[PDB]
Amino acid sequence: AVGIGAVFLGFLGAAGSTMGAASMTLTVQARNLLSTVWGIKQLQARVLAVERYLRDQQLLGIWGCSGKLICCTNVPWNSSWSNRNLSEIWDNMTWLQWDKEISNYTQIIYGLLEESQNQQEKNEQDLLALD
Amino acid sequence: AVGIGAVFLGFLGAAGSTMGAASMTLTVQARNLLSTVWGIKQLQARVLAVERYLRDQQLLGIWGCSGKLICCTNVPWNSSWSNRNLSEIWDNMTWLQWDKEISNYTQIIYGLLEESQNQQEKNEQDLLALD
Amino acid sequence: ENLWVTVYYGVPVWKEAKTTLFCASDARAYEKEVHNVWATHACVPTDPSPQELVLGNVTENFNMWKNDMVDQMHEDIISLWDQSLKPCVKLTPLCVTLICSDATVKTGTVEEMKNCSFNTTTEIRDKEKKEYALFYKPDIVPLSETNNTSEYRLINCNTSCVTQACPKVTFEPIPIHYCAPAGYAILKCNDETFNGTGPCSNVSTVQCTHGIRPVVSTQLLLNGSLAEKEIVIRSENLTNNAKIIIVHLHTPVEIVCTRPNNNTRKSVRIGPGQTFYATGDIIGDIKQAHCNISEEKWNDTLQKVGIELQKHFPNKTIKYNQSAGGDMEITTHSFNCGGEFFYCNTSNLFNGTYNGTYISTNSSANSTSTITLQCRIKQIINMWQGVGRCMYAPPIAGNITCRSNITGLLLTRDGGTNSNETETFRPAGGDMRDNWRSELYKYKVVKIEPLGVAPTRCKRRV
Amino acid sequence: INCNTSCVTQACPKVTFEPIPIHYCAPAGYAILKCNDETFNGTGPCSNVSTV
Amino acid sequence: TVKTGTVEEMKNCSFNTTTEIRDKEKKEYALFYKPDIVPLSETNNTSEYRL
Ligand SMILES: *[C@@H]1O[C@H](CO)[C@@H](O[C@@H]2O[C@H](CO)[C@@H](O[C@@H]3O[C@H](CO)[C@@H](O)[C@H](O)[C@@H]3O)[C@H](O)[C@H]2NC(C)=O)[C@H](O)[C@H]1NC(C)=O
Ligand SMILES: *[C@@H]1O[C@H](CO)[C@@H](O[C@@H]2O[C@H](CO)[C@@H](O[C@@H]3O[C@H](CO)[C@@H](O)[C@H](O)[C@@H]3O)[C@H](O)[C@H]2NC(C)=O)[C@H](O)[C@H]1NC(C)=O
Ligand SMILES: *[C@@H]1O[C@H](CO)[C@@H](O[C@@H]2O[C@H](CO)[C@@H](O)[C@H](O)[C@H]2NC(C)=O)[C@H](O)[C@H]1NC(C)=O
Ligand SMILES: *[C@@H]1O[C@H](CO)[C@@H](O[C@@H]2O[C@H](CO)[C@@H](O)[C@H](O)[C@H]2NC(C)=O)[C@H](O)[C@H]1NC(C)=O
Ligand SMILES: *[C@@H]1O[C@H](CO)[C@@H](O[C@@H]2O[C@H](CO)[C@@H](O)[C@H](O)[C@H]2NC(C)=O)[C@H](O)[C@H]1NC(C)=O
Ligand SMILES: *[C@@H]1O[C@H](CO)[C@@H](O[C@@H]2O[C@H](CO)[C@@H](O)[C@H](O)[C@H]2NC(C)=O)[C@H](O)[C@H]1NC(C)=O
Ligand SMILES: *[C@@H]1O[C@H](CO)[C@@H](O[C@@H]2O[C@H](CO)[C@@H](O)[C@H](O)[C@H]2NC(C)=O)[C@H](O)[C@H]1NC(C)=O
Ligand SMILES: *[C@@H]1O[C@H](CO)[C@@H](O[C@@H]2O[C@H](CO)[C@@H](O)[C@H](O)[C@H]2NC(C)=O)[C@H](O)[C@H]1NC(C)=O
Ligand SMILES: *[C@@H]1O[C@H](CO)[C@@H](O)[C@H](O)[C@H]1NC(C)=O
Ligand SMILES: *[C@@H]1O[C@H](CO)[C@@H](O)[C@H](O)[C@H]1NC(C)=O
Ligand SMILES: *[C@@H]1O[C@H](CO)[C@@H](O)[C@H](O)[C@H]1NC(C)=O
Ligand SMILES: *[C@@H]1O[C@H](CO)[C@@H](O)[C@H](O)[C@H]1NC(C)=O
Ligand SMILES: *[C@@H]1O[C@H](CO)[C@@H](O)[C@H](O)[C@H]1NC(C)=O
Ligand SMILES: *[C@@H]1O[C@H](CO)[C@@H](O)[C@H](O)[C@H]1NC(C)=O
Numbered sequence: 091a092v093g094i095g096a097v098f099l100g101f102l103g104a105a106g107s108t109m110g111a112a113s114m115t116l117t118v119q120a121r122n123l124l125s126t127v128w129g130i131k132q133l134q135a136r137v138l139a140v141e142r143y144l145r146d147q148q149l150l151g152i153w154g155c156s157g158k159l160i161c162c163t164n165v166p167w168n169s170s171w172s173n174r175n176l177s178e179i180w181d182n183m184t185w186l187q188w189d190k191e192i193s194n195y196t197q198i199i200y201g202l203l204e205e206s207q208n209q210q211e212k213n214e215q216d217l218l219a220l221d
Numbered sequence: 222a223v224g225i226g227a228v229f230l231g232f233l234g235a236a237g238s239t240m241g242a243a244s245m246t247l248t249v250q251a252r253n254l255l256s257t258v259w260g261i262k263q264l265q266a267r268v269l270a271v272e273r274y275l276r277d278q279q280l281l282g283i284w285g286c287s288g289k290l291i292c293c294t295n296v297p298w299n300s301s302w303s304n305r306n307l308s309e310i311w312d313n314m315t316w317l318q319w320d321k322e323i324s325n326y327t328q329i330i331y332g333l334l335e336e337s338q339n340q341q342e343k344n345e346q347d348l349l350a351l352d
Numbered sequence: 353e354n355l356w357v358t359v360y361y362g363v364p365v366w367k368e369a370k371t372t373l374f375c376a377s378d379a380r381a382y383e384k385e386v387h388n389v390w391a392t393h394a395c396v397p398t399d400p401s402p403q404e405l406v407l408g409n410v411t412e413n414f415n416m417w418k419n420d421m422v423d424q425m426h427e428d429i430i431s432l433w434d435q436s437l438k439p440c441v442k443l444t445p446l447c448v449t450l451i452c453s454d455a456t457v458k459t460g461t462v463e464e465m466k467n468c469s470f471n472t473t474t475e476i477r478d479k480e481k482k483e484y485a486l487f488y489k490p491d492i493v494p495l496s497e498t499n500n501t502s503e504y505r506l507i508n509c510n511t512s513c514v515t516q517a518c519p520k521v522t523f524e525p526i527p528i529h530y531c532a533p534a535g536y537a538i539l540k541c542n543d544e545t546f547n548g549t550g551p552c553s554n555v556s557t558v559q560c561t562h563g564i565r566p567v568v569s570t571q572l573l574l575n576g577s578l579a580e581k582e583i584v585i586r587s588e589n590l591t592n593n594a595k596i597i598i599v600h601l602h603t604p605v606e607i608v609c610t611r612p613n614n615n616t617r618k619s620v621r622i623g624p625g626q627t628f629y630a631t632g633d634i635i636g637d638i639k640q641a642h643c644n645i646s647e648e649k650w651n652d653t654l655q656k657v658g659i660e661l662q663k664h665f666p667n668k669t670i671k672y673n674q675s676a677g678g679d680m681e682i683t684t685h686s687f688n689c690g691g692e693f694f695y696c697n698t699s700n701l702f703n704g705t706y707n708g709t710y711i712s713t714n715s716s717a718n719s720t721s722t723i724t725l726q727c728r729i730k731q732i733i734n735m736w737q738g739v740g741r742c743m744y745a746p747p748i749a750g751n752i753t754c755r756s757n758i759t760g761l762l763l764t765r766d767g768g769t770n771s772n773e774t775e776t777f778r779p780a781g782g783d784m785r786d787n788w789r790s791e792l793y794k795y796k797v798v799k800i801e802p803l804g805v806a807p808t809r810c811k812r813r814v
Numbered sequence: 815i816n817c818n819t820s821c822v823t824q825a826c827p828k829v830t831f832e833p834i835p836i837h838y839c840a841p842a843g844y845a846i847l848k849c850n851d852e853t854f855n856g857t858g859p860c861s862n863v864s865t866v
Numbered sequence: 867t868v869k870t871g872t873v874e875e876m877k878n879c880s881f882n883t884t885t886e887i888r889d890k891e892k893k894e895y896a897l898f899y900k901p902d903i904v905p906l907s908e909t910n911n912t913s914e915y916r917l
């Protein structure tokens with residue numbers, strides 16, 4: 091998923107391919123997010139573009155992850171959201187239509203991830219105080 | 222490279238010394254980056270100062286590093302850029318004139334670092350799925 | 353085996369949203385004088401590149417008449433027009449009772465202008481002085497309680513705002529690029545058979561769009577983009593009578609307009625240095641005020657319109673009648689060239705029919721036969737409702753010409769009935785939005801949602 | 815004399831144009847350099863360079 | 867004065883204004899409340915008032 095190399099097109103260069111086929115190239119893709127009275131609209135665009143970026147970063151930083159590309163966690167997947175085969179979704183669907191199916195339960199997942207993060211940090215403190 | 226202690230001068234307090242002699246003190250040095258119609262220019266300066274900082278942070282975050290001070294990687298150094306002795310450059314030159322020699326091949330190095338990062342993350346996934 | 357949840361950063365998902373755009377222009381337009389044109393003082397240079405990127409598969413649903421970008425252009429152009437007249441203001445007379453007589457010239461007389469004796473203030477607010485200037489007949493109204501043919505008043509003063517444009521600005525339609533800030537992307541539908549809405553499939557992505565020309569225009573559209581291969585006819589309801597239909601032509605048909613010589617622009621100063629210009633005498637003889645259009649190009653172009661329009665209609669005929677009356681701002685075609693404004697009458701263009709019996713006119717035995725139209729020249733412009741549409745235009749130095757490459761038509765169908773198998777089209781005007789909507793239908797802007805979640809067998813090591 | 819052109823405006827009787835000293839600071843990300851060489855002859859290699 | 871009697875708290879004041887054309891003045895009238903008009907005069911001239 092890295093054979094393009096010459097990437098100046100952002101995430102949009104992989105659209106339409108399978109989700110498995112886009113597991114890489116996320117480096118350059120992410121980079122494209124940041125690179126008279128008229129000055130008021132010209133300025134406002136720059137400030138809100140930053141505000142969007144940081145809030146997305148908070149979501150990753152809140153529940154304990156770095157290495158923005160891919161973050162796995164320990165919360166088990168509740169099959170009641172899809173009841174579908176993994177390989178069928180992962181190889182047949184691209185990111186486009188996948189979003190339109192999981193976009194209803196996003197808030198549920200965010201909550202569980204936050205709870206899990208607190209459980210782990212405290213667990214570390216007990217194991218730290220042993221040494 | 223840490224004997225100053227009283228650092229309220231930023232990076233500029235170490236200029237002229239050898240690159241080896243400035244390997245530390247980067248903590249306080251980095252801190253100095255962030256600490257009517259006239260309001261328009263007064264505001265614009267603050268927003269562009271932030272925009273400069275984050276894009277530099279992206280470059281570090283894109284190819285997988287934290288601990289902003291010093292980041293070593295696994296890409297081998299291609300001697301065709303310098304063909305010079307390490308100790309000669311590292312002890313005789315300060316950062317000033319060093320930049321003026323390596324500033325031509327910066328884009329090449331950034332590309333290789335990005336490719337290396339993707340290779341490592343995927344390698345982890347295979348070794349993760351073994352356990 | 354078991355499944356857990358993984359979050360991904362960098363996922364290509366698009367969503368619809370409203371935002372603003374970036375104004376930019378080519379570098380050769382920024383080394384000129386300030387406000388010559390407004391882009392020089394207003395926008396930022398950019399690169400017309402990168403390379404348009406075509407997507408693997410994807411399916412998208414554009415809609416010409418559901419797009420905020422078009423209204424945004426309208427707001428920007430109206431806003432900048434008002435801002436351009438703030439540092440260039442006149443408040444002085446030009447409203448005093450004007451005494452007038454039949455306009456005469458060194459070689460004869462003229463019927464379309466009047467020579468009007470004035471009553472103004474000198475540079476010192478103690479004295480009035482005598483003066484004269486010439487004006488076009490349609491911009492002066494005989495304000496009187498009776499038939500007093502010696503008491504006239506400048507048409508515009510019924511309300512206000514007689515302001516004057518600067519003699520150092522030009523309204524040449526410099527092309528404008530629309531870019532989007534980071535976090536968004538622009539999509540372009542390349543399907544030339546695209547019939548207004550629904551599943552585009554050749555969808556390319558762009559970071560910054562193509563050139564567009566801010567031309568003010570009515571029924572006949574002047575410089576612009578070209579069609580790909582053949583005539584394209586867009587429409588909304590068709591059935592319904594109150595809608596406007598867009599006809600995109602694969603011509604272009606040559607058209608040229610001109611006017612005769614004038615002597616100069618008298619420089620008159622009122623009070624504290626408020627210089628203004630007015631049309632003075634005219635040398636030598638006096639003529640029109642006309643536009644020329646090649647006949648043989650017009651003929652087959654107007655016929656080709658029939659062969660494509662008949663795609664939606666079974667066995668019904670196309671007819672062409674004059675516009676629904678009203679004053680000149682509605683029926684007559686208005687456009688700008690070289691700082692002058694013309695209002696032309698198009699009777700000789702839209703008279704005829706098409707019944708399916710297509711007749712190609714051959715051979716090109718005589719290309720000299722052309723069509724000719726009459727025009728008028730105003731000076732009070734009432735362009736846009738809410739922009740301070742009150743500009744008093746100055747005249748310019750001598751005889752000027754204008755050559756244009758006419759690309760499309762704005763038509764509307766008459767609301768006829770009683771076995772109307774001879775459906776007729778009238779010329780109709782409309783908001784400038786409709787012209788820019790015809791130029792800007794290819795482009796849409798969406799939001800990037802870079803975060804996504806998917807199931808996987810991966811798990812975090814404790 | 816002034817009315818040949820315009821703008822006869824009048825200054826306020828509550829303002830003064832005393833040259834109050836002004837400081838020039840730079841926002842973060844930049845720095846100011848000051849050349850202390852009193853024999854500095856307009857251009858070229860300063861060596862007593864301080865930072866501000 | 868009013869069609870049915872008079873009023874003590876207002877005055878009817880004859881005006882001297884400019885027409886829509888800056889060449890002529892015209893006659894007009896409006897009514898005002900007593901406390902918003904002051905008799906600007908050097909003497910007891912009850913026929914010269916100012917807003
Ligand atoms: C383009 O050139 C062609 C040459 O064929 C024109 O064809 C001529 O068009 C006129 C006007 O449509 C025709 O005369 C008319 O005949 C109809 C009845 O069929 C009648 O109702 C009208 O009053 C008029 O007399 C004419 O017969 C036809 N042929 C020639 C040689 O004149 C065509 O009209 C031109 N473009 C336009 C505007 O149609
Ligand atoms: C002022 O008025 C004169 C008269 O309308 C205009 O001069 C004329 O310009 C037109 C357009 O150039 C001439 O037609 C063409 O001339 C070109 C010249 O190279 C020739 O290449 C063409 O095939 C055709 O002959 C027209 O004959 C000409 N007359 C003269 C005396 O040259 C002029 O354009 C007007 N505009 C200004 C601002 O001067
Ligand atoms: C427009 O009317 C004015 C008013 O008469 C004319 O101005 C006078 O022209 C005559 C002859 O050219 C001179 O004797 C006068 O001295 C002019 N008056 C002033 C105030 O200069 C003018 O000629 C007319 N112009 C046109 C084109 O009709
Ligand atoms: C001032 O404005 C009024 C309208 O706001 C104009 O009055 C009309 O005059 C036109 C012809 O000029 C007539 O067709 C209309 O019937 C009249 N009334 C209306 C409703 O417009 C008037 O012409 C304007 N001109 C002045 C008074 O200088
Ligand atoms: C463009 O094509 C679409 C279909 O892709 C046309 O949609 C029509 O929509 C009306 C709404 O009731 C339907 O009743 C028609 O049946 C649709 N067409 C078909 C074949 O189903 C749309 O009109 C076309 N646009 C134009 C104006 O050409
Ligand atoms: C108005 O301005 C003009 C110049 O813009 C002045 O005209 C000159 O007057 C001076 C003396 O006052 C002469 O030396 C010049 O030769 C005249 N012409 C020029 C080119 O300046 C005029 O004085 C000004 N004063 C007025 C008219 O009130
Ligand atoms: C300041 O010193 C510099 C040299 O440090 C002078 O530079 C001169 O530049 C011209 C350009 O052709 C040379 O030809 C001279 O030979 C230079 N001087 C020497 C000694 O080489 C510069 O002029 C001095 N500035 C002033 C104006 O004092
Ligand atoms: C206010 O004073 C004016 C001035 O006389 C009155 O206006 C006149 O009223 C009379 C009778 O109503 C008319 O004959 C005149 O034609 C009016 N003058 C004008 C210029 O129209 C007015 O009636 C007074 N109004 C009040 C309420 O006192
Ligand atoms: C369209 O989908 C197919 C599925 O195999 C894919 O192979 C093809 O590469 C996609 N589009 C393009 C042109 O890549
Ligand atoms: C016109 O202006 C002149 C300047 O002399 C002034 O005398 C005159 O009264 C004004 N109107 C008439 C009546 O000419
Ligand atoms: C899509 O558009 C591009 C634009 O050049 C075109 O070249 C291509 O042919 C179109 N798609 C197909 C199916 O070829
Ligand atoms: C069309 O382009 C031409 C060619 O330069 C320019 O002359 C003309 O002004 C533009 N047309 C209009 C509407 O002015
Ligand atoms: C306009 O078009 C829509 C779609 O065909 C149709 O439903 C509607 O009936 C048309 N207008 C009217 C008022 O019929
Ligand atoms: C346009 O409508 C008028 C109404 O009388 C009609 O007389 C005329 O013939 C129509 N069509 C043409 C050919 O002008």
Ligand SMILES: *[C@@H]1O[C@H](CO)[C@@H](O)[C@H](O)[C@H]1NC(C)=O
Pocket residue numbers: 674683684697698699726
């Ligand atoms: C328009 O032109 C035609 C041809 O000169 C003429 O018959 C008609 O009176 C003109 N006026 C309008 C506004 O129709």
Ligand SMILES: *[C@@H]1O[C@H](CO)[C@@H](O)[C@H](O)[C@H]1NC(C)=O
Pocket residue numbers: 699700703704
């Ligand atoms: C309309 O077309 C006919 C074709 O003969 C032409 O005679 C007439 O001048 C044109 N104008 C009118 C009034 O129809």
Ligand SMILES: *[C@@H]1O[C@H](CO)[C@@H](O)[C@H](O)[C@H]1NC(C)=O
Pocket residue numbers: 575604757
């Ligand atoms: C008009 O179309 C022709 C076709 O060759 C083109 O060469 C010319 O540039 C166009 N003129 C303008 C000014 O658009």
Ligand SMILES: *[C@@H]1O[C@H](CO)[C@@H](O)[C@H](O)[C@H]1NC(C)=O
Pocket residue numbers: 850862
């Ligand atoms: C450099 O400038 C400082 C300013 O006080 C001065 O004290 C010092 O003497 C100068 N450098 C040298 C060589 O002393």
Ligand SMILES: *[C@@H]1O[C@H](CO)[C@@H](O)[C@H](O)[C@H]1NC(C)=O
Pocket residue numbers: 881882883891892893
């Ligand atoms: C009031 O206005 C009128 C309008 O005729 C004017 O004639 C008059 O002199 C002004 N003052 C007086 C004295 O009425």
